[PDB]
Amino acid sequence: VTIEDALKVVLRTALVHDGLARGLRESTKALTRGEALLVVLVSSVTEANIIKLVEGLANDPENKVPLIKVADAKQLGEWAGLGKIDREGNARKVVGASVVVVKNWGAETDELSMIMEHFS
Amino acid sequence: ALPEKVIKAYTTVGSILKTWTHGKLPKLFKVIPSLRNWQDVIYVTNPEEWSPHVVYEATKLFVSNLTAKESQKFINLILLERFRDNIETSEDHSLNYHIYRAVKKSLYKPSAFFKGFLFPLVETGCNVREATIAGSVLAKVSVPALHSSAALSYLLRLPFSPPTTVFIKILLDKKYALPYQTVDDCVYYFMRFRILSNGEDATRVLPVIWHKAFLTFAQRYKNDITQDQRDFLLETVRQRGHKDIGPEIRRELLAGASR
Amino acid sequence: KAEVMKEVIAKSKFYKQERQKAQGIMEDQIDNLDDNFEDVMSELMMTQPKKPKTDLDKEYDIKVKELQLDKRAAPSDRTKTEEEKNAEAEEKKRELEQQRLDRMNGMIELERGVEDLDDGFWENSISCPRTHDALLDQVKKLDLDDHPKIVKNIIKAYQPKLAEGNKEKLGKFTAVLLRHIIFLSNQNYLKNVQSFKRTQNALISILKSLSEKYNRELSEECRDYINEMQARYKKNHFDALSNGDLVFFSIIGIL
Amino acid sequence: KVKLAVLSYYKVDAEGKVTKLRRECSNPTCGAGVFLANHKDRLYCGKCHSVYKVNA
RNA sequence: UUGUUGAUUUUGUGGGUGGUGGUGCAU
DSSP states (O other), X not given: OOHHHHHHHHHHHHHHTTOEEESHHHHHHHHHHTOOSEEEEEXXXXXXXXXXXXXXXXXXXXXXXXXXXXXXXXXXXXXXXXXXXXXXXXXXXXXXXXXEXXXXXXXXXXXXXXXXXXXX | OOOHHHHHHHHHHHHHHHHOOSSOOOHHHHTTTTSTTXXXXXXXXXXXXXXXXXXXXXXXXXXXXXXXXXXXXHIIIIIHHHHHHHHHHSTTOOOOHHHHHHXXXXXXXXXXXXXXXXXXHHTTTOOHHHHHHHHHXXXXXXOOHHHHHHHHHHHHHSOOOHHHHHHHHHHHHTOOOOBHHHHHHHHHHHHTXXXXXXXXXXXXXXXXXHHHHHHHHHHHHGGGBOHHHHHHHHHHHHHHOOSSHHHHHHHHHHHOOBO | OHHHHHHXXXXXXXXXXXXXXXXXXXXXXXXXXXXXXXXXXXXXXXXXXXXXXXXXXXXXXXXXXXHHHXXXXXXXOOOOOHHHHHHHHXXXXXXXXXXXXXXXXXXXXXXXXXXXXXXXXXXXXXXXXXXXXXXXHHHTTSOGGGHHHHHHHHHHHTOTTTSTTHHHHHHHHHHHHHHHHHHHHHSOOSTTHHHXXXXXXXXXXXXXXXXHHOHHHHHHHHHHHHHHHHHXXXXXXXXXXXXXXXXXXXXXXXX | OOSSHHHHHEEXXXXXOEEEXXXXXXXXXXXXXXXXXXXXXXXXXXXXXXXXXXXX
């Protein structure tokens, strides 16, 4: 089980309990409120200051939140559930997500343990 | 208790809502959703005494501003009871035009609608007249497929009642792209009325609305079921088919291909 | 009766004025509250109270996401019986025929008459080719028998539902296709008359589908060719006339 | 239209510290992360619809 | 897209629908 595969289920589990903040504006609102438990950020964001802002908010001394890097925004959006499913079952009309923040895990899974263990 | 100066002011507001028909709503009224204790402020405004025009505008105001959870409470406590109150107390047991719109504006938030009117109503002794009026509101307004399918799945698992059978027919009439899980939930609901060990649903008399609902399901979703499900549904017509609707159901079901 | 009517009118005016006075009072009452709005809110803000989902609710949020995962069925309208379909067809055959006989008799659809026209007449991935040349370049490397495949593929790639503006492209393509059908006939085909026959009729069939929805585009192009034919006949006489010209008149008869 | 409105609302220095140039909403119900729409004469809350002074 | 909000809408192309419709009739 890879770390990326661990995040794929974890984001899906967070979706089931409405525990994800999807997008920058929702992500920063979560981070400023202290509601963020994990931040998933895309490394390939065209605008650098987006990376600087999320990294700064995630690294704030009062509320340190773990941060993860994702190669492509499109796959992060798919994990966030933005994309729709086609008759073949493949994700279609998917929307890219630059940043996704988890407000509630929902269910305690073994895959959550690896992610926090990796951070620890 | 709220501040005493506030109480008089919102008591004054409540008087306006009694006779308010048009114009601008009081600015104090418009800012209630932002307040944490909107319920307490809402009670002093006497929601039962709100005019039908106020109920329409208040629902616009609160559904848009309040959160999904808080909207559900505003939904469940005020507009649902007013909906039931108006039908019961009206001479012809009809619903006011403004209240009728107020249900539509609540549909803009599908989740808070379903958990605040539909499921509470059908689970709290909904009558045939109530289901017809609510079903008409459901039929005309566009609802998302995802929320509708979840709503359809909930109703199908509930104990059979003619009022619930209506809503099942409305959702099936909506001609949605039901997920196959919902299609199986639909098929599961219709099998349980066959005689086999089985519950009373096998021997319970089935009104026309169920047959129309069962004819309703077959017309679109004949191509979205497996052969085994098709064979099971065919047995339902043989055992529990209607005199005139039943042959039609068998024709539609046989005409469908397997998924 | 008159005294009854006057009493009715006075009562209606009385109630109308009473309603108007009530409205006047309501507006003033609204104004006063807007004036004390700040004081009332400030007291509410100070008294603001300090900072689990139902199991019934907990299930629903799970459903929508599971439904989000599960594939979605397509809906199908009720199947009409053979008698109704046969019944439905025959009136349309009749209606077109009763419309047909009217147009035989002078009913012109702007339902005016021909006599109206007779007033003052004597007294005075896949690319959609917008032009005929563009289509040839796309089909330049393709064999003669392969033209229907590419032409069909262009229609599928640019259906109206796929994107906005596809209707004009296909309509322009309708004009383009007609010129190609006429163009091929001008080209020598004695070598592979069979292959030409299998492309030529197929392209006409596609135009028949295109004409059914892109008439105005086709009719405009058809009129343009007629003017061009007349202009060429003006200078070349019979030399202007060609096989595709004969074909062109035949296709108009089809469509 | 507004594009990357989050970019302007939050400013980052070279050090990376995050600074807020737009005041938070005073209403506890709105919570943190809510910024007031800024105008010369007064400062306005979109969610609550309250009006605050720029000086405050 | 809502009125700040978050996918509930908007756009283009197709497209089913008379129905909080009445009136009498047969336990």
